[PDB]
Structure 1
Amino acid sequence: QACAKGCELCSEVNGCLKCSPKLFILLERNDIRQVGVCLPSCPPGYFDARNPDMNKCIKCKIEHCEACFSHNFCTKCKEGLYLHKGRCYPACPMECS
Structure 2
Amino acid sequence: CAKGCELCSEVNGCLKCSPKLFILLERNDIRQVGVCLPSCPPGYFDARNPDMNKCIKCKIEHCEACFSHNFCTKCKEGLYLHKGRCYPACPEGSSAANGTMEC
TM-score (normalizing by structure 1): 0.58
Higher strand content, 1 or 2: 1
Unaligned ranges ≥5, structure 1? none
* Larger deviation, residues 33-42 vs 60-69: 60-69
Report the alpha carbon displacement of residue 45 of structure 1 after superposing the two structures with TM: 1.9
RMSD, aligned CA: 5.7
* Larger deviation, residues 29-38 vs 67-76: 67-76
Report the alpha carbon displacement of residue 38 of structure 1 after superposing the two structures with TM: 0.2
Unaligned ranges ≥5, structure 2? 92-100
For 2:75, the equivalent position in structure 1 comes to 77
- Once the two structures are superposed, what CA deviation does each residue of 1:49-75 show, in whole Å capped at 9, x if it has no partner? 101232100101425999999999999
Q: Which runs of 4+ in 1 moved over 6 A?
A: 64-96
Distance 1:48 1:36 in 2: 15
Distance 1:5 1:57 in 2: 17
Distance 1:32 1:13 in 2: 12
| Cα 1:95/1:60, change in 2 over 3 Å | closer
Q: Rg: which structure is higher?
A: 2
Maintained 8 Å contact 2:47/2:54: yes
Distance 1:95 1:12 in 2: 44
| Cα 1:58/1:95, change in 2 over 3 Å | closer
| Cα 1:54/1:69, change in 2 over 3 Å | farther
Maintained 8 Å contact 1:15/1:36: yes
